[PDB]
């Protein structure tokens, strides 16, 4: 009972936004990939930074609250005011709109930048079950889990075993073509034994 | 009622692997950001890297190749690790401590904060 | 890295009277949490530095009133009310918002007395 993030995002996740949760024969284990969620909380900060920036224009009184002015010039006034009043509550409706849309598709995109490193980096020792997962066709420790994490796995220590594992028909598994040196050869607990050795007997 | 307290080599020599130590008196280690900051001698506050239980060395890029950082939870003490180190290393090394809430997600993607100081250990790095 | 640059650089002061020191920042502060994080220390003769302001504006427990943060997220600004004798030493401003945390120049302030 494992799931991922094509599915839901885990509640269990607070040392990040992005982890690893894994499943071998010591058991669950959920831990934060630190590069990736540094990556998203990094560009969200780059757009407040840029938000939160101030106006430096001062702007002064040209009405007058306690004392009306004339009627053409302060509907000329408000009439200019009204119009900027327009301008600038659609220019902000519209920054918050596109900004939670670029931002909500930033962290989608930093998610499967993750998945897609860790799919790499497997090779082709591992399969894609389709809900954000990786099954593993060979034995995976703590520590070769860790592996996976901090971008050390290395495809060819598994990969032989992996294969294997993995083309199979009734437990079964593929196997290598037989010595190449011109004597016929059986298969015989794993190995190819040779033709010679089974006719120099004798007969009963 | 929380108090930290250097220790290590007063000279290291050079290349050597310069090593200190900071005890804590009246805290919990689990509880806290755990940051090295070394001061050369008359020259600005130089920020090492942090630390926290559950593992995260997150340095200063002038360092990380040579920095190495780790904390005791029997013990109570941070401790650090300066492989191959320079005459550009001598400095006063205070540690310092910053408050840690768990459930602050976006707490461990921003720099400790520097709430308590260490007396500061002075590593003259020479032959 | 973000780079905190503070001014001036030896601020000799009259035995009360007030003075401010401003810290100018290479990028913005503010982070996903609200708080932009610039930090303002007090390092005495021969001491470990001491945190005089936390988050620009809060003042930490244990301190004078007469020192004030303000600032806004470029540009900020160190204030004490009546420098005394006591307030003597090295003072610095750290960004705590961007890896790595980084700290001013330092300003000097000596007593005129």
């Known amino acids: 009972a494992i799931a991922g993030f094509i599915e839901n995002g885990w509640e269990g996740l607070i040392d990040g936004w992005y982890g690893f949760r894994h499943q071998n024969a010591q058991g669950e284990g959920t831990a934060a990939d630190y590069k990736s969620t540094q990556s998203a909380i990094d560009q969200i900060t780059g757009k407040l930074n840029r938000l939160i920036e101030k106006t430096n224009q001062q702007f002064e009184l040209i009405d007058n609250e306690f004392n009306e002015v004339e009627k053409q010039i302060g509907n000329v006034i408000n009439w200019t005011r009204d119009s900027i009043t327009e301008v600038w509550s659609y220019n902000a409706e519209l920054l918050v709109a596109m900004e939670n849309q670029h931002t909500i598709d930033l962290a989608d995109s930093e998610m499967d930048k993750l998945y897609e490193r860790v799919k790499r980096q497997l090779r082709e020792n591992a399969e894609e079950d389709g809900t954000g997962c990786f099954e593993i066709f060979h034995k995976c420790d703590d520590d070769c889990m860790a592996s996976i994490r901090n971008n050390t796995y290395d495809h060819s220590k598994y990969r032989e075993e992996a294969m294997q594992n993995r083309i199979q028909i009734d437990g079964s598994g593929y196997i290598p073509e037989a010595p190449r040196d011109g004597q016929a050869y059986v298969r015989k607990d794993g190995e190819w034994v040779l033709l010679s050795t089974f006719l120099s007997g004798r007969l009963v | 009622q929380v108090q930290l307290q250097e220790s290590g080599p007063g000279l290291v020599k050079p290349s050597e692997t310069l090593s200190l130590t900071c005890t804590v008196s009246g805290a919990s280690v689990s509880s806290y950001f755990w940051s090295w900051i070394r001061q050369p001698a008359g020259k600005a506050l130089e920020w090492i890297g942090r630390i926290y239980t559950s593992g995260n060395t997150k340095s200063n890029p002038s360092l990380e190749s040579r920095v190495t950082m780790s904390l005791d939870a029997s013990k109570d003490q941070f401790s650090l690790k300066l492989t191959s180190v320079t005459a550009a290393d001598t400095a006063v090394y205070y540690c310092?401590?910053?408050?840690?809430?768990?459930?602050?997600?976006?707490?461990?993607?921003?720099?400790?904060?520097?709430?308590?100081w260490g007396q500061g250990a002075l590593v003259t790095v020479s032959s | 890295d973000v780079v905190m640059t503070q001014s001036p650089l030896s601020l000799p002061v009259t035995l009360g009277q007030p003075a401010s020191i401003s810290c100018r920042s290479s990028?913005?502060?503010?982070?996903?949490?609200?708080?932009?994080?610039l930090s303002w220390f007090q390092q005495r003769p021969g001491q470990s530095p001491r945190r005089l302001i936390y988050?620009?504006?809060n003042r930490d427990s244990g301190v004078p009133d007469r020192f004030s943060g303000s600032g806004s997220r470029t540009d900020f600004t160190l204030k004490i009310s009546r420098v005394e004798a006591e307030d003597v030493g090295v003072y610095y401003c750290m960004q705590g918002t961007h890896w790595p945390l980084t700290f001013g120049g330092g300003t000097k302030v000596e007593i005129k007395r």
């Open positions: 988050k620009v504006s």
């Open positions: 990028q913005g502060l503010a982070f996903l949490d609200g708080n932009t994080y």
């Open positions: 310092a401590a910053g408050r840690l809430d768990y459930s602050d997600t976006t707490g461990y993607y921003k720099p400790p904060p520097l709430d308590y």
